[PDB]
Design a protein around this ligand. Structure first.
Ligand SMILES: *[C@@H]1O[C@H](CO)[C@@H](O[C@@H]2O[C@H](CO)[C@@H](O)[C@H](O)[C@H]2NC(C)=O)[C@H](O)[C@H]1NC(C)=O
Lengths: 47, 148, 647, 982
C-alpha cells in the first residue's frame, strides 16, 4: 500500500479493470476519467 | 459557576441600560404579576425622571400603560396618575443584562428583569440565584412563559 | 479422387448464428457428417455441433448453423481467443483454429440536436440491433464524458423493442463548454460499442449578421490568380448595415478536423462595408508565395481559411465570421475503378472500368479517358502496350475498357488519365494500378462476370452470371459450385451442371432481400486427377440497391411549401409491416447527418472487388475460411480478416 | 508599425507566459501599467511580460489612426489567444420525440409550435426486418409580415417610457399597415382611446425590410399591467399580448418575522397565539402598499420541504448573485437535506401519489444539482472559487463536504474524491497541522492585528477543511488522510484557546466534534463555547450565540445576522454530536424562528449549517402526530381564513395579507409543531438611517475616445485591520432605458490584471463580485452606458455594495444617470399624465369659489381629512418634496386625529409643478388618508398631495384688495363646517 504501481486497463469486453494493488490498498489514478490505459499508485486503506 | 458579584454599587439607570433597551419580567413573587410584562423607554432622560411604557397581556388582549420613573441612585419611584410604587434595584449583572428589583409593601416582593434582546446566560443565572435567595422559598411567577 | 470443402466465415462472432457449408465431391454413397465448434486446443468442451446428411437427394451439399454462446466463455483475466472448427465423418476428420470476436450487433446513439446551450436537456435514445440486424433486446449502458475527459453520468436500461429510451440529460446552468461524448455499450457478454458527440456552446448575443460568399467552393487553376469573395452584413431588424470596416485575414489549413492554421499577414486587406455588401479578390499565387508552397502543384487538398471582422461605424459594435476552409483543387476530376478486380486470369480478356467524378464526388459524363499499360511476363521481358481511349458513359458515368494480353503475362501495370479539351496536362486526373496474375500449378483459371453491373442490382430481379473457365482438364469438370455471402454470413450455396457443349454457361441467381445492400459471390470448380485436388475459384462484389426490409414513409397533410405558426397538421406514418417508429422534429438550423447502410456493411469480412492471387486468396478476400483435402497453400499469418486498402 | 508589433507577437508566439502579454497590451486609460501589474498573482514572469507589452503598447498607441489600432488588435488578437466554444444563434427545443407502434399505417395530428422555424421531421423504423431511416420531411413555419415589441423588464411608476418595436415585411412588395395600442386603465397615454384602443395611422413598409414602431406611455399604478399591440394590414390582423411591470420608487426593503406554534408545549413553553402588528415604516414611499406574505408550514423542516417539492422555482437565497461555485453547491443543498429527511426518517407517505416516483424525481434532481459544480473543477480534481481562476483550499473543502454528504444517496466517483482529498492533504497542509489557502479568495473578514488576524484565519480555514474531509472520508478512507486529520485535529486542539471570536471557537468546536469527542481539550472548548451562550427568558425560551466574544463586546444584538446564525448553527451541531438534548431546544426554537420564508437564512454558510441543524434535530427527536386548527384573522377586521393542518397536507401555499390591520395567528388544542413566518416588503425613499459599512460614490461622465464610475471603499469594524473586506458584491441598478457596455465589463474580469472576479447583467442590474474591497483607498468600476429607449422623468437608481457572507455589512446609495433639471412647468396639454395623480393648487384669490362647493367638497364621504394649516419649511428628498406645516384649525377628522398647533408633514411627488407651495403661507388642505409613523417616542402624521386633494392659498390679513370678500366667504365656509357636523 506504499509505492506499488497499479494500472487501469480495458478488458476483452471493454470494461475498465484496475489491478496491481494488494489486499488492503486502493488504486488512485491521477489521470482524467477518459484515459483507458493509465497508471496510478496504491494507498493504505483503513481497517 | 464563576462569581456572581456584579455592578457595585447598584445604579438603577445603569441597570436600565441608561434607557436604551427594553426589559422583560421573567420571575416575580407577586401572585398578580402581569403576563408578558415588558418595560421599554417612552422618552428621553429629563432631570431625574424618565418615561417608561409598560406593555402586558390580559387574556388574549394586549394592553399598554404609560408610567414615569423617578430615579435616585438605586431607588426608583414609579408612578402613573395617582398610583405610586416604590422599588429598589438590589442586584445588577456585570453587563447590565439582568437585575433584581425589590418592591416595597407589607410583604415585599422580588422581581427579576432581563434584556428583551437576551442576556449572557451566566449573568442571567446569577440574577436567578439572587432572586431565589431573596425570595427564600416563596412561589415564583414566570410572566414570560404565558404564551407571549 | 474424393474431395470435401468446408466454408465458414473468416472469423467466428460470439453470439452470432454462423452458417457452415459443407460440399463434398466424388462420393456416390450417402453418409453423415458432424460439424462442431469446440474448445481450443483440447476439444474437451463442445460450444456447439450439428449433424448434416449428404446424399444424392442432397447433391452431397449441406449446411449447419452453429452458435458460440457468450455465457459459455470465461470472463476477465484469461479470456478465450480461439476455438476449433471440426468436421468429422466416416471418411475424414479435419479441424482448424478460428479466432473469435466479442463484437456483436450495432448501437446507434441518436441525440435530438448536435449543439446545445446551457440549461437545455439532451434527448437521447439508442437503436440496438444484434448481428443479424434484429432488435438486440440487451440491456445497454450510456456514459457521458465532458470536454475535460470526466465521466459525469452513467445510466443503464433494458431493451424491449430494439429502441431504448433514456432519460434526458440536463446541461448544467454553467457547464463545461466543448465537445461532449456519449458512449453506448452492452452490460454483458459483448464488446460492442456505440459513440455519439454533441457540443455545448455558450450563447453570445450578436449585434448583426455577417455572411461570407466565396466565388466557388473549390479553388482551381483558373481562380489560382484571382478568387472573388463577397462579404455581406445586415442588422437583425431586416436592414442592411450602411457603413462598416471590413478586415479579412487568410490562412492555409491542413484539414478541417484540426483547428490548426497558418496565417498570412501579407493578405490582411481591409475594405469598407457599404450599403450591406463589400467585395475583395484574393490572389492565391502571390499570398501563398509566403509560407513556402510557391506553386499550385502544392496546396492540393489543403484548405484556405478565411477570417472576417466587421466593425459597424454608427455604434462601433464588432462582429466576426469565418469560412473554415476552401479546398484547393488541382484537378477537376478524380478517378476510381468500378467492378474490376486487380487480378489477371491468363487467357481471359481483362476488363478495366474507370470512373470519373468531380470535386463533389459526382459522376461526370462525356469525359475522355486514356489507358496505358505495361506488361511483365514470366521471363521478366517488359512490353509497352499501345494506348487506348474511351469516353465516359453519361448514362452511368462509366468508361469501359477491354484488354487482350498474352497468356504468359504475370504483372499488368496500367495507368489511366483524363483527356479534357480545356485542361492543362497538370490539371488532368491520373491514377495508377497494378494487377497480378492468378497462380495455378495446373494452368487452370476461372473468370466470372454477370452480364453487367449497370444498373445496380435491384431486389426482385435476376442475376445472370457468366462462368468462363480457361484451362486444360476443361471437359472433365463435372459441375460448378457457388457460395453467396452477405453481411458477413453465407446466405446461399450450391452447384450447377456444367454443359459439355460450350465454354461458358449462364448461372442464374435470384437477387433477394438477404443480399441488401451488398453481397459477394464465389464460384469454383475442382480440377482432379493425380498429385492433389485443386480448387479453381473467383469472386465478385455485387452492389445492390439499399432497400429497407420494412419500408418506412412519413408525410405531412396538408402538403405545403410553408406553414403558419400554431397550425394543426396531421402526420401520416406508413410501413410495409407492423413496425416501431421513433420520431423527431428538430430545427434544421442546427445542422448548418447519419447514414446507417454504410456503417452496417462493416460486418462484411471481404475486401476489394473480388479475385485473388490464388484459390486461398480468393476465399480470404471474400471473407471466408475453408477446410479442404485439396491444396490449401495460403499466405503467411493469414488469420485476421483482410483490410480494405486505401490509396 | 507592423514590424514593431511583429516583433512583439513573434516574441510571445510560443512563450510560456503568452496571455499576460496579450491582456497587458489591452487599452486601460484609467490605470498605469504598474498599477495593473500590481494585481497580477501569477508570478514574476507574467508580471514582466505584462509590463513589457503594456508599456510598448501604450507607447505605440500615441497619435495612432483607427486603422492602425484595429490592425494592431488584429495582429495581437489572433496569434496569442487560442479559441473559445460559443454560438451566436439559439435553437429551440425539439419535439415529437416519441416512439409509436405503427400497424403498417398510423396517422397522428398535432399543432405546430409557435416559432419561425424550418422544422425537420425524421423517422426511424425498427422491426424484425431491421432499421429503416425514412426520408426526412420538412415543415417550415413562417410568417411574412409580423410585429414584435421590445418591452423592458421593469419601469418605475411616473416615468414616461418610449416602447420601441418593429414590423417585419419579408414579402418582396411593400404594403400598408397600422399598429394600435390597447389602453389599460393604469397606463396613461397622451392620446385618447377612440373605440378603446388607440388609433390606426396607415403607414407603408417597403418590400423585404421593416418599419419602426413607437408608443409613449406613463404608468400611474404599480404592478403588472397587460398591454396589447395590434398589427393590421390589408391581409389580416394580429394581436400581440404583452405585460408591463411597474415598480415603485425608492429602495425595496424586506423584514422578516418568525413564530413557532407548539400547542402542547412539547419542546418548550406552550405557544398557541401570536400577533404580527401592522407598523408603517418611516420613509415609506407614498401611495404604496405595505406588502406582506404569510407562510404556515407543518414541521421544523416544512419550509425546506415546500421549497423543494413545490417546483415554482426556487432559490432560498435569491438576493445573493450567482458566479461563485459556492452558489452551484448551495443550489443542491436544499434538495439534499429534503432527501435526507425523507429517506432517513422514512416519510415518503407524505406524498398522496406514488412515493417511488417522487423518490425517483428527487434522486434525479439531486444528481443534476450535484453536476452543477463540475465546471469549477480543475484537471487535478481541485476546485476553484471562480471559473478559470486559481484552485481554492476553502472551496475544495466545501465541495468535499457537499459531495461527501450527497454520496450517501447518489454514489460519487471514488477516484475523483480521492484525488481531491489527496490534493488537499498532500500540498496545502503545513507541518503544524493547519491548512493554508492557495488562492486570494477571502471568504470571511476577522478581527485582530495582521498577526492575530492571520492566526484567526488559519484556525478557521483548518476547521473548515477538517469539516470537509470528515464529511467525505468514508468515500476514500485512506490512512494518509486519516493521519492528516489527526495532525489538523491536534492543531485545532492546541490553538483554539484562548479564543479570539465566538465564530472561530464554534467552528473549531464543531470540527473537533466530528472526531474524538473524549479529548479533554475538546471538552474545554465546548465549555468555553457554552460560556458565551445568550438566552432570552429565564427559564430560557431562546438560546443563541453572538459572533463576538463577551469580553470584547458586551452588547446584545437586536436582530440576527449571518454570523449569528452560523455561530449558533455550529454550536447546535456540536451539541447534537454530543447528544446534549437538554441544551438544544431553545436553540432549535431560535434557529427555527430566525428562518425565512423559502427555507433559507441570511447568507450561504449559515443557511447550510442551519438547515443541517434543523433537519438532524428533526430526525433525532420523536416525530409527533400533526393535527391543528390554524386560524389567521385580522384584529379589527374580518377573519382572513383558517385551515386544518394534518400529516395529509401541511405544506400549504402562502397567503398575501392585503388589509392594513394587525394579523393574528392562533390555534386551539393541537398535536404537532408548526412554523408561521411573515415576510414584509416595503419601499423606502431614503437610506440615511441605515448603517453604512462602505464609503460609496458614483458618477456619470462624458468620455472622449456617457460612462458610469462607481467607487466603494471598506469601513473596517472595531479591531478590524486595514487589509480590506472579504468577498464583496457591487450591485449597480441601472436606470430605466439605460444599457451597460458589456465589453467594458468583460475587459475588467477576463484579464490577468483583473479588477473584478466575476460580472453579470441580470434584470437591469450590473452585478460585480470581488475578492476584497480595500479600506485604504477607493476601488472603482468604470463602464460605458448608452440609452436604449427614451425615458422622461427618470427615477433614480440604487448602488449597493455588501459582503457576500455578511450582507449586514452593506451600504445603499441613490444615484441618477440624468442631470436633468429644471421641472418648471409642463405647458398646457401633453400634460395630463404627469399631473394625473397629484394635486392642483386653486386659483390665487379666486372669488368665484362659491362657499357651498367648498363645503360639499369637504363633507364628501371620500374626503377623510380637511383643515387649515400654515407651512413652516420646504424640503426636497430624492423623488419627493416634504412640506413641514403647522396644524391651525381642524375642520374634519374621519380617521386618526392630530393635535392643534402640532407639526404636520405633507408630501408631493417632485414631478408635480402646479402644487407649488410657498414657505410661510397659509393654505386650506383637504384630502384622503394619511400615514401614522412612530418617530422618537411619539406619533407623526404625513399627508400625500394627490388628485382630489383640494388646496387653496389663504392670506391672513385683509389688504388683498378684493380678497376681503374672498376671506369673507372662506370664513363663511370655515364657520359653517364645524357648527353642523354633516
Ligand atoms: C388583450 O388581449 C387578450 C387576448 O385576446 C384579451 O384577453 C381576452 O379578452 C376577451 C374579452 O375582451 C375574453 O373574452 C377572452 O377570453 C380573453 N382571453 C384570454 C386568453 O384572456 C385581453 O382582454 C386584452 N386586453 C386588453 C386591455 O384589451
Amino acid at each position: 500500500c506504499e509505492e506499488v504501481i497499479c494500472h487501469r486497463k480495458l478488458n476483452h469486453l471493454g470494461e475498465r479493470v484496475t489491478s496491481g494493488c494488494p489486499t488492503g490498498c486502493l488504486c488512485v489514478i491521477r489521470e482524467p476519467d477518459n484515459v483507458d490505459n493509465a497508471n496510478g499508485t496504491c494507498y493504505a486503506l483503513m481497517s | 459557576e464563576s462569581d456572581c458579584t456584579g455592578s457595585e454599587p447598584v445604579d438603577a439607570f445603569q441597570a436600565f441600560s441608561e434607557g436604551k433597551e427594553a426589559y422583560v419580567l421573567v420571575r416575580s413573587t407577586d401572585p398578580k404579576a402581569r403576563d408578558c410584562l415588558k418595560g421599554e423607554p417612552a422618552g428621553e432622560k429629563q432631570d431625574n425622571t424618565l418615561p417608561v411604557m409598560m406593555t402586558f397581556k390580559q387574556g388574549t388582549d394586549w394592553a399598554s400603560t404609560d408610567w414615569t420613573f423617578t430615579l435616585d441612585g438605586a431607588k426608583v419611584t414609579a408612578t402613573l396618575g395617582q398610583l405610586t410604587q416604590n422599588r429598589e434595584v438590589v442586584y445588577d449583572s456585570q453587563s447590565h443584562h439582568c437585575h433584581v428589583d425589590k418592591v416595597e409593601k407589607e410583604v415585599p416582593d422580588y422581581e427579576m428583569w432581563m434584556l428583551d434582546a437576551g442576556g449572557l446566560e451566566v449573568e442571567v443565572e446569577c440574577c436567578r440565584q439572587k432572586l431565589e435567595e431573596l425570595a427564600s422559598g416563596r412561589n415564583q411567577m414566570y410572566p414570560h412563559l404565558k404564551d407571549c | 479422387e474424393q474431395t470435401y470443402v468446408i466454408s465458414a466465415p473468416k472469423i467466428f462472432r460470439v453470439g452470432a448464428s454462423e452458417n457452415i457449408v459443407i460440399q463434398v465431391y466424388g462420393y456416390t454413397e450417402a453418409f453423415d457428417a458432424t460439424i462442431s465448434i469446440k474448445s481450443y486446443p483440447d476439444k474437451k468442451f463442445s460450444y456447439s455441433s450439428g449433424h448434416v446428411h449428404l446424399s444424392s437427394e442432397n447433391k452431397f451439399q449441406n449446411s449447419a448453423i452453429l452458435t458460440i454462446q457468450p455465457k459459455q466463455l470465461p470472463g476477465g483475466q484469461n479470456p478465450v481467443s480461439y476455438v476449433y472448427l471440426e468436421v468429422v465423418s466416416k471418411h475424414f476428420s479435419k479441424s482448424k483454429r478460428m479466432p473469435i470476436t466479442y463484437d456483436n450487433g450495432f448501437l446507434f446513439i441518436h441525440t435530438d440536436k448536435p449543439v446545445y446551450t446551457p440549461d437545455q436537456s439532451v434527448k437521447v435514445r439508442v437503436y440496438s440491433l444484434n448481428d443479424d440486424l434484429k432488435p438486440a433486446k440487451r440491456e445497454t449502458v450510456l456514459t457521458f464524458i465532458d470536454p475535460e475527459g470526466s465521466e459525469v453520468d452513467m445510466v443503464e436500461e433494458i431493451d424491449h423493442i430494439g429502441i431504448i429510451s433514456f432519460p434526458d440529460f440536463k446541461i448544467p446552468s454553467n457547464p463545461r463548454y466543448g465537445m461532449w461524448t456519449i458512449k453506448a455499450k452492452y452490460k454483458e457478454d459483448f464488446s460492442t460499442t456505440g459513440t455519439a458527440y454533441f457540443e455545448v456552446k455558450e450563447y453570445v448575443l450578436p449585434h448583426f449578421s455577417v455572411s461570407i460568399e466565396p466565388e466557388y467552393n473549390f479553388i482551381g487553376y483558373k481562380n489560382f490568380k484571382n478568387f472573388e469573395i463577397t462579404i455581406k452584413a445586415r442588422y437583425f431588424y431586416n436592414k442592411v448595415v450602411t457603413e462598416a470596416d471590413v478586415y479579412i485575414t487568410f490562412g492555409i489549413r491542413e484539414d478541417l478536423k484540426d483547428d490548426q492554421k497558418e496565417m498570412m499577414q501579407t493578405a490582411m486587406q481591409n475594405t469598407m462595408l457599404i450599403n450591406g455588401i463589400a467585395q475583395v479578390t484574393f490572389d492565391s499565387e502571390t499570398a501563398v508565395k509566403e509560407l513556402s508552397y510557391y506553386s499550385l502543384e502544392d496546396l492540393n487538398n489543403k484548405y484556405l481559411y478565411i477570417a472576417v471582422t466587421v466593425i459597424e461605424s454608427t455604434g462601433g459594435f464588432s462582429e466576426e465570421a469565418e469560412i473554415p476552409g476552401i479546398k484547393y483543387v488541382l484537378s477537376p476530376y478524380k478517378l476510381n475503378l468500378v467492378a474490376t478486380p486487380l487480378f489477371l486470369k491468363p487467357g481471359i480478356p481483362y476488363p478495366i472500368k474507370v470512373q470519373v467524378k468531380d470535386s463533389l464526388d459526382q459522376l461526370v459524363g462525356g469525359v475522355p479517358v486514356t489507358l496505358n499499360a505495361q506488361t511483365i511476363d514470366v521471363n521478366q521481358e517488359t512490353s509497352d502496350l499501345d494506348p487506348s481511349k474511351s469516353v465516359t458513359r453519361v448514362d452511368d458515368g462509366v468508361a469501359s475498357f477491354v484488354l487482350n494480353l498474352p497468356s504468359g503475362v504475370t504483372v499488368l501495370e496500367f495507368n489511366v488519365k483524363t483527356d479534357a479539351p480545356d485542361l492543362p496536362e497538370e490539371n488532368q486526373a491520373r491514377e495508377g494500378y497494378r494487377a497480378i496474375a492468378y497462380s495455378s500449378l495446373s494452368q487452370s483459371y476461372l473468370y466470372i462476370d454477370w452480364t453487367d453491373n449497370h444498373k445496380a442490382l435491384l431486389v426482385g430481379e435476376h442475376l445472370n452470371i457468366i462462368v468462363t473457365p480457361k484451362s486444360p482438364y476443361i471437359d472433365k469438370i463435372t459441375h460448378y459450385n457457388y457460395l453467396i455471402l452477405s453481411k458477413g454470413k453465407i446466405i446461399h450455396f450450391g452447384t450447377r451442371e456444367k454443359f459439355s457443349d460450350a465454354s461458358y454457361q449462364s448461372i442464374n441467381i435470384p437477387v433477394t432481400q438477404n443480399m441488401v445492400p451488398s453481397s459477394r459471390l464465389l464460384v469454383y470448380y475442382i480440377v482432379t486427377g493425380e498429385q492433389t485436388a485443386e480448387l479453381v475459384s473467383d469472386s465478385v462484389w455485387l452492389n445492390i440497391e439499399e432497400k429497407c426490409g420494412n419500408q418506412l414513409q412519413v408525410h405531412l397533410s396538408p402538403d405545403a411549401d410553408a406553414y403558419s405558426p400554431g397550425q394543426t397538421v396531421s402526420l401520416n406514418m406508413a410501413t410495409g409491416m407492423d413496425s416501431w417508429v421513433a420520431l423527431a422534429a428538430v430545427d434544421s438550423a442546427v445542422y448548418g447527418l447519419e447514414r446507417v447502410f454504410q456503417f452496417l456493411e462493416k460486418s462484411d469480412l471481404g475486401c476489394g472487388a473480388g479475385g485473388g492471387l490464388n484459390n486461398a486468396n480468393v476465399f480470404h478476400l471474400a471473407g471466408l475460411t475453408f477446410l479442404t483435402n485439396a491444396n490449401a497453400d495460403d499466405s503467411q499469418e493469414n488469420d485476421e480478416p483482410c483490410k480494405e486498402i486505401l490509396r | 508599425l507592423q514590424k514593431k508589433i511583429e516583433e512583439i507577437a513573434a516574441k510571445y508566439k510560443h512563450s510560456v507566459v503568452k496571455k499576460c502579454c496579450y491582456d497587458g497590451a489591452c487599452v486601460n486609460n484609467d490605470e498605469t501599467c504598474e498599477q495593473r501589474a500590481a494585481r497580477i498573482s501569477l508570478g514574476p514572469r507574467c508580471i514582466k511580460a505584462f509590463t513589457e507589452c503594456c508599456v510598448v503598447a501604450s507607447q505605440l498607441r500615441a497619435n495612432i489612426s483607427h486603422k492602425d489600432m484595429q490592425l494592431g488588435r488584429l495582429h495581437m488578437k489572433t496569434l496569442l489567444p487560442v479559441s473559445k466554444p460559443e454560438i451566436r444563434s439559439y435553437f429551440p427545443e425539439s419535439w415529437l420525440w416519441e416512439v409509436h407502434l405503427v400497424p403498417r399505417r398510423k396517422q397522428l395530428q398535432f399543432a405546430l409550435p409557435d416559432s419561425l422555424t424550418t422544422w425537420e421531421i425524421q423517422g426511424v423504423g425498427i422491426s424484425n426486418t431491421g432499421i429503416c431511416v425514412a426520408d426526412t420531411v420538412k415543415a417550415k413555419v413562417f410568417k411574412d409580415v409580423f410585429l414584435e415589441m421590445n418591452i423592458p423588464y421593469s419601469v418605475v411608476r411616473g416615468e414616461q417610457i418610449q416602447l420601441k418595436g418593429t414590423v417585419y415585411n419579408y414579402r418582396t412588395s411593400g404594403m400598408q399597415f397600422c399598429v394600435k395600442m390597447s389602453a389599460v386603465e393604469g397606463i396613461c397615454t397622451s392620446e385618447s382611446p377612440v373605440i378603446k384602443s388607440s388609433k390606426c395611422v396607415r403607414q407603408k413598409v417597403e418590400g423585404s425590410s421593416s418599419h419602426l414602431v413607437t408608443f409613449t406611455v406613463l404608468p400611474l399604478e404599480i404592478g403588472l399591467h397587460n398591454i396589447n399591440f395590434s398589427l393590421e394590414t390589408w391581409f389580416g390582423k394580429e394581436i400581440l399580448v404583452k405585460t408591463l411591470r411597474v415598480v415603485p420608487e425608492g429602495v425595496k426593503r424586506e423584514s422578516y418575522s418568525g413564530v413557532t406554534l407548539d400547542p402542547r408545549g412539547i419542546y418548550g413553553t406552550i405557544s398557541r397565539r401570536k400577533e404580527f402588528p401592522y407598523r408603517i415604516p418611516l420613509d415609506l414611499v407614498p401611495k404604496t402598499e405595505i406588502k406582506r406574505i404569510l407562510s404556515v408550514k407543518g414541521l421544523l423542516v416544512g419550509e425546506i420541504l415546500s421549497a423543494v417539492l413545490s417546483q415554482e422555482g426556487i432559490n432560498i437565497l435569491t438576493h445573493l448573485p450567482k458566479g461563485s461555485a459556492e452558489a452551484e453547491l448551495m443550489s443542491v443543498v436544499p434538495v439534499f437535506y429534503v432527501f435526507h429527511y425523507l429517506e432517513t426518517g422514512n416519510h415518503w407517505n407524505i406524498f398522496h401519489s406514488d412515493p417511488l416516483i417522487e423518490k425517483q424525481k428527487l434522486k434525479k434532481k439531486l444528481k443534476e444539482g450535484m453536476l452543477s459544480i463540475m465546471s469549477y473543477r480543475n484537471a487535478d480534481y481541485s476546485y476553484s472559487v471562480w471559473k478559470g481562476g486559481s484552485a481554492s483550499t476553502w472551496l475544495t473543502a466545501f465541495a468535499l463536504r457537499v459531495l461527501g454528504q450527497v454520496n450517501k444517496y447518489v454514489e460519487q466517483n471514488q477516484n475523483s474524491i480521492c484525488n481531491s482529498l489527496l490534493w488537499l492533504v498532500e500540498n496545502y497542509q503545513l507541518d503544524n497541522g493547519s491548512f493554508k489557502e492557495n488562492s486570494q479568495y477571502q471568504p470571511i473578514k476577522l478581527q485582530g492585528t495582521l498577526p492575530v488576524e492571520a492566526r484567526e484565519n488559519s484556525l478557521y480555514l483548518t476547521a473548515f477543511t477538517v469539516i470537509g474531509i470528515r464529511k467525505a472520508f468514508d468515500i476514500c478512507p485512506l490512512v494518509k488522510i486519516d493521519t492528516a486529520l489527526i495532525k489538523a485535529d491536534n492543531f485545532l486542539l492546541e490553538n483554539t484557546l484562548p479564543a479570539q471570536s465566538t465564530f472561530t471557537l464554534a467552528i473549531s468546536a464543531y470540527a473537533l466534534s466530528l472526531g474524538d469527542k473524549t479529548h479533554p481539550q475538546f471538552r474545554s472548548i465546548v465549555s468555553a463555547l457554552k460560556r458565551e451562550a445568550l438566552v432570552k427568558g429565564n427559564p430560557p425560551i431562546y438560546r443563541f450565540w453572538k459572533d463576538n466574544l463577551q469580553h470584547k463586546d458586551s452588547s446584545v444584538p437586536n436582530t440576527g445576522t449571518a454570523r449569528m446564525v452560523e455561530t449558533t448553527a455550529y454550536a447546535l451541531l456540536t451539541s447534537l454530536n454530543l447528544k446534549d438534548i437538554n441544551y438544544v431546544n431553545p436553540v432549535i426554537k431560535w434557529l427555527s424562528e430566525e428562518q425565512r420564508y423559502g427555507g433559507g437564512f441570511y447568507s450561504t454558510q449559515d443557511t447550510i449549517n442551519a438547515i443541517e441543524g434543523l433537519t438532524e434535530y428533526s430526525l433525532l427527536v420523536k416525530q409527533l402526530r400533526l393535527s391543528m386548527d390554524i386560524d389567521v384573522s385580522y384584529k379589527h377586521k374580518g377573519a382572513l381564513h383558517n385551515y386544518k393542518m394534518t400529516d395529509k397536507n401541511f405544506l400549504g401555499r402562502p397567503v398575501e395579507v392585503l388589509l392594513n390591520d394587525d394579523l393574528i395567528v392562533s390555534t386551539g388544542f393541537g398535536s404537532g409543531l408548526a412554523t408561521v413566518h411573515v415576510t414584509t416588503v416595503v419601499h423606502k425613499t431614503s437610506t440615511s438611517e441605515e448603517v453604512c459599512s462602505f464609503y460609496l460614490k458614483i458618477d456619470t461622465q462624458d468620455i472622449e475616445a456617457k460612462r458610469i464610475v462607481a467607487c466603494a471603499s471598506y469601513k473596517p469594524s472595531r479591531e478590524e485591520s486595514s487589509s480590506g473586506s472579504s468577498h464583496a458584491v457591487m450591485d449597480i441598478s441601472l436606470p430605466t432605458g439605460i444599457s451597460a457596455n458589456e465589453e467594458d465589463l468583460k475587459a475588467l474580469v477576463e484579464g490577468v490584471d483583473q479588477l473584478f472576479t466575476d460580472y453579470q447583467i441580470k434584470d437591469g442590474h450590473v452585478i460585480l463580485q470581488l475578492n476584497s474591497i480595500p479600506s485604504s483607498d477607493f476601488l472603482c468600476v468604470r463602464f460605458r452606458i448608452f440609452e436604449l429607449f427614451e425615458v422622461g422623468f427618470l427615477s433614480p437608481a440604487t448602488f449597493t455594495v455588501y459582503e457576500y457572507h455578511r450582507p449586514d455589512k452593506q451600504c445603499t446609495m441613490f444615484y441618477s444617470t440624468s442631470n436633468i433639471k429644471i421641472q418648471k412647468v409642463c405647458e398646457g396639454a401633453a400634460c395630463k399624465c404627469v399631473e394625473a395623480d397629484c394635486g392642483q393648487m386653486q386659483e390665487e384669490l379666486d372669488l368665484t369659489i362659491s362657499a357651498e362647493t367648498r363645503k360639499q367638497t369637504a363633507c364628501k364621504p371620500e374626503i377623510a381629512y380637511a383643515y387649515k394649516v400654515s407651512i413652516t419649511s420646504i424640503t426636497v428628498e430624492n423623488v419627493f418634496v416634504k412640506y413641514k406645516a403647522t396644524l391651525l384649525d381642524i375642520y374634519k377628522t374621519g380617521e386618526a386625529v392630530a393635535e392643534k398647533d402640532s407639526e404636520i408633514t405633507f408630501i408631493k411627488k417632485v414631478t408635480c409643478t402646479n402644487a407649488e407651495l410657498v414657505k410661510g403661507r397659509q393654505y386650506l388642505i383637504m384630502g384622503k388618508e394619511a400615514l401614522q409613523i412612530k418617530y422618537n417616542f411619539s406619533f407623526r402624521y404625513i399627508y400625500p398631495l394627490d388628485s382630489l386633494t383640494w388646496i387653496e392659498y389663504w392670506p391672513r390679513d385683509t389688504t388683498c384688495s378684493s380678497c376681503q370678500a374672498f376671506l369673507a366667504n372662506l370664513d363663511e365656509f370655515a364657520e359653517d363646517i364645524f357648527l353642523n357636523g354633516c
